[PDB]
């Protein structure tokens, strides 16, 4: 488990080396209704279902069919012209009121970006001290190790 990240100042060759040894040990081991059916089929096939491309074109001196199609264009154009009246009445006040809401929504996210930033650096900060604590202790151990190694020889 133990591998000191901050203390071990470990080349790319060692990653490539260890990857090969890990690789060799891997060589050894080796709820909705009908809605979901049509939605998954639409996405898989990459084709959206065609809508009513009729109101836009039409034609004068048609028949009973275009008499309907004509009368459709009138009522929707009157609804359109009424739908543009209540927008222009308020105008830009309704738009800029929503623009202000979006600024309150945005700043909230970036506050959380900082809260995460601080606690993430704070955890790493605690790790750092641990790394330097033990890395010294390991240094102490190795020095003592080398002392015996030659001490035992010089006695014999």
């Amino acid at each position: 488990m133990d591998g000191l990240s901050f203390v071990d100042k470990i080349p790319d060759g060692y990653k490539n080396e260890i990857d090969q040894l890990v690789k060799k040990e891997f060589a050894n081991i080796k709820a909705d209704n009908s809605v979901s059916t049509l939605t998954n089929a639409l996405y898989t096939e990459y084709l959206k279902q065609r809508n009513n491309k009729k109101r836009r074109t039409p034609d004068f001196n048609d028949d009973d069919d275009t008499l309907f199609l004509e009368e459709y264009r009138r009522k929707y154009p009157r609804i359109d012209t009424s739908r543009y009246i209540p927008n222009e009445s308020s105008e830009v006040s309704l738009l800029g009121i929503v623009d202000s809401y979006l600024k309150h929504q945005e700043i909230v996210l970036d506050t959380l970006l900082p809260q995460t930033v601080s606690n993430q650096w704070r955890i790493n900060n605690d790790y750092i001290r641990q790394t330097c604590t033990i890395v010294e202790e390991m240094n102490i151990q190795q020095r003592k190790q080398i002392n015996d190694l030659e001490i035992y020889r010089k006695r014999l």
């Binding site: 133990d2 591998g3 470990i10 060692y14 990653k15 080396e17 260890i18 040894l21 809605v35 979901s36």
Partner: protein
């Protein structure tokens, strides 16, 4: 489609204008004549207070439920997307913790291999002499 006194299907649904609850004209009228009160809330109520007979006038006896149906199917769409995302991010935590710990555990080997190697030449050069 039920009266709130007897429990019968009301053929003349009248309602009291103190507590909103559709009774039948016969039963509510017998309750008012018994004691001038509403049977559910025990508030003040009279016979003239009751609104009797059906309401259809300048109305005529589709479309609105299609939009309701469109809402109901969307309600599932949202519920599905939530549970799909939970498992998405919850698995990413396992992915992240593993990959980090994998390359962390990988550095154990790099260290271990070089020390093992050091033990070989040391002993070999010593055992030689």
């Amino acid at each position: 489609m039920l009266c709130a006194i007897s429990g019968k299907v009301p053929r003349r649904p009248v309602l009291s204008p103190k507590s909103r609850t559709i009774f039948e004209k016969s039963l509510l009228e017998q309750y008012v004549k018994d004691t001038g009160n509403d049977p559910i809330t025990n508030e003040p109520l009279s016979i003239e207070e009751i609104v009797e007979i059906v309401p259809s006038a300048q109305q005529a006896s589709s479309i609105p439920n299609l939009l309701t149906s469109l809402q109901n199917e969307w309600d599932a769409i949202m519920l599905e997307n939530f549970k799909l995302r939970s498992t998405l991010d919850s698995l990413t935590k396992k992915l992240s913790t593993v990959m980090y710990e994998r390359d962390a555990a990988k550095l154990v080997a790099a260290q271990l291999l070089m020390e093992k190697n050091e033990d070989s030449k040391d002993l070999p050069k010593s055992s030689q002499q």
